[PDB]
A = this chain, B = another copy of it.
Amino acid sequence: NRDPASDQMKHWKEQRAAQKPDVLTTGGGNPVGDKLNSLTVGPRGPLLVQDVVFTDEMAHFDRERIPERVVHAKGAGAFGYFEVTHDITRYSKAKVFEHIGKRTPIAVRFSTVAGESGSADTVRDPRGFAVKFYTEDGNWDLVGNNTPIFFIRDALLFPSFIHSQKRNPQTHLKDPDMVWDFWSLRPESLHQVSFLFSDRGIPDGHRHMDGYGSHTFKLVNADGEAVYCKFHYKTDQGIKNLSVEDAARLAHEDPDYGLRDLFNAIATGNYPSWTLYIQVMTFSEAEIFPFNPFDLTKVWPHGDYPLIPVGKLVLNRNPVNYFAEVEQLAFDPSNMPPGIEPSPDKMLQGRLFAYPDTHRHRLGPNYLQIPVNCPYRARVANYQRDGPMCMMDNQGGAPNYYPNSFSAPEHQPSALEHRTHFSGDVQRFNSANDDNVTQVRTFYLKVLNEEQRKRLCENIAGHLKDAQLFIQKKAVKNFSDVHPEYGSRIQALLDKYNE
């Protein structure tokens, strides 16, 4: 007949067949007698407050919407599991990696970045790749993207960055004067602004892009020896991007392209999968290493720090109810079980607060209690109580202060975080100059092929062409600071567009 997604209701009925339908009730469970005609005095008379059937349904409809994610509003999500296939026990003591074959339930959400909830899937914009691992040591959230780097390296620049990528404060339209102005004055974005305008910019679905932990992290073993690393999970279905035009029509053809693709895939037994890897770098290595190992606009090279195989990510389940299971999904980079710890990454360090914070605003103080966010394969026992919309039993009559002498939750010395020594004055160290070009250049020439090199410049100019001339010059100046031909090639394009 037609695709699985299209036949959503058709199947819901079929399976629910040979069953008397449920009795329509109110929020409180009172059976409604008639829900098609309001209660009025006389056929042409006014509506009566007496109609609580009405107010019940209407009041709830009046509140359906919650704020969309400040970033990554438009996204898709599914569920699967993570299977350890290799032993990195010597790096992490994290139960998630315990043994070979250790299955741990996961939840994933894919998303775009700037576009609101109604935007279209297939547009130039990075791709969010969130992974929630429901482990025995609580949940671990690997909040990644389909790229290993990022436009900036200091939290303070983030809000501002995002603004430029979004709408104008007054006209409310997308504004290139803000886009490029920000990028012009901020040349560190060069590495990412390239990757973005490259083929990878617009992936053909969520299944044909790679996952990247992006930031540098820390791994701890059962013997307290820590080491840094990067997370990588390559697509088993391979990298397949969309053409600028192909995606262009799809854009208005099917703005939910990603959604559709991901659904039917899993809906037909054709579950996608990713292979998780890790680059490991010692504290000595990070010591000698040659730009800041925590710079988010830089990447460790496979050459020196090679990719190690860790396990498999398999998505074999679709959300039953999208709002409840995907939209309400909350991923906190701060959720890191023992064996995994943050790293000095200024950027990351900031995310440590932003994410749980906004979640309390977007979803509510007790969000970790929403089914899909709850650490259910673990046991939440603590001294936190109440808060609005408190689910469960608020931990019943348990003593609510630590320490105590009434057998309340004890602590785990084992779970103590690895300690690192840090010297140096406490202040705001400038990081606007850490080489916003070396790595970039290598991508252009080394990583990029003559063919992509063309479309990149072309793609950039295609957009930059709408910005003030003075902004254009700045942008070209940085690209040429990456390599004469880069900017030169771009610049050439610019002049034509400028009629």
Q: Note all chain B residues with C-beta closer than 8 A to A496.
A: none
Q: Note all chain B residues with C-beta closer than 8 A to A406.
A: 9-10, 12-13, 16, 177, 181
Smallest Cβ-Cβ distance to A359: which chain B residue: B62
| Cβ-defined partner of A170 (8 Å) among B8, B40, B170 | B8
Q: A5-B173, A349-B49, A398-B12 are in contact. Are A332 and B28 (CB under 8 A)?
A: yes
Q: How far is the CA of A54 from the CA of B351 in the complex (A)?
A: 11
Q: Note all chain B residues with C-beta closer than 8 A to A167.
A: 322
* Residue A448 interfacial (CB < 8 Å): no
* Residue A148 interfacial (CB < 8 Å): no
CB <8 Å contact, A25 and B378: yes
CB <8 Å contact, B349 and A30: no
Q: Note all chain B residues with C-beta closer than 8 A to A276.
A: none
Q: A399-B169, A407-B16 are in contact. Are A156 and B358 (CB under 8 A)?
A: no
* Residue A288 interfacial (CB < 8 Å): no
Interface residues on A, range: 35 or more
Write the nearest CB–CB distance from A350 to chain B, whole angstroms. 6
9 A–B contact pairs at CB < 8 A? Answer: A9-B175, A28-B139, A30-B375, A47-B155, A57-B382, A65-B362, A169-B323, A186-B403, A370-B390
* Residue A400 interfacial (CB < 8 Å): yes
Contacts of A1-44 to chain B: CB distance below 8 A: 2, 5-6, 8-10, 12-13, 16-17, 19-44
CB <8 Å contact, A47 and B44: no
CB <8 Å contact, A256 and B388: no
CB <8 Å contact, B54 and A381: no
CB <8 Å contact, A426 and B46: yes
CB <8 Å contact, A263 and B31: no
CB <8 Å contact, A386 and B65: yes
CB <8 Å contact, A70 and B76: no
Smallest Cβ-Cβ distance to A323: which chain B residue: B386
Q: How far is the CA of A423 from the CA of B41 in the complex (A)?
A: 7
CB <8 Å contact, A33 and B416: yes
* Residue A185 interfacial (CB < 8 Å): yes
**Contact code string A327-369 (vs B, CB < 8 Å = 1, else 0):** 1100010111110001010100110111011101111111111
Q: How far is the CA of A169 from the CA of B388 in the complex (A)?
A: 16
* Residue A200 interfacial (CB < 8 Å): no
Q: Note all chain B residues with C-beta closer than 8 A to A29.
A: 135, 137-139, 335, 337, 375, 377-380
Contacts of A376-423 to chain B: CB distance below 8 A: 377-417, 419-423
Smallest Cβ-Cβ distance to A361: which chain B residue: B63
10 nearest CB pairs, A to B: A29-B138, A29-B375, A42-B424, A33-B416, A118-B119, A116-B118, A29-B378, A170-B397, A118-B118, A62-B358
| Cβ-defined partner of A67 (8 Å) among B46, B66, B168 | B66
CB <8 Å contact, A40 and B346: yes
Chain A, interface SS category:
loop
Q: A2-B466, A28-B375, A49-B350 are in contact. Are A169 and B419 (CB under 8 A)?
A: no
CB <8 Å contact, B412 and A352: no
Q: How far is the CA of A438 from the CA of B126 in the complex (A)?
A: 53
* Residue A260 interfacial (CB < 8 Å): yes
* Residue A425 interfacial (CB < 8 Å): yes
Q: Note all chain B residues with C-beta closer than 8 A to A118.
A: 73-74, 115-120
Write the nearest CB–CB distance from A429 to chain B, whole angstroms. 4
CB <8 Å contact, A401 and B38: no
**Contact code string A289-305 (vs B, CB < 8 Å = 1, else 0):** 00011100000000000
CB <8 Å contact, A410 and B259: no
Q: Which of A9, A19, A387 has the most CB of B within 10 A?
A: A9
CB <8 Å contact, B386 and A33: no
Write the nearest CB–CB distance from A130 to chain B, whole angstroms. 14
Q: How far is the CA of A349 from the CA of B1 in the complex (A)?
A: 42
| Cβ-defined partner of A334 (8 Å) among B52, B156, B379, B412 | B52
Q: Which of A168, A181, A185, A370 has the most CB of B within 10 A?
A: A168
Q: Note all chain B residues with C-beta closer than 8 A to A6.
A: 173, 175-177, 466
Q: Which of A45, A344, A395, A413 has the most CB of B within 10 A?
A: A45
Q: Note all chain B residues with C-beta closer than 8 A to A181.
A: 9, 401, 404-406
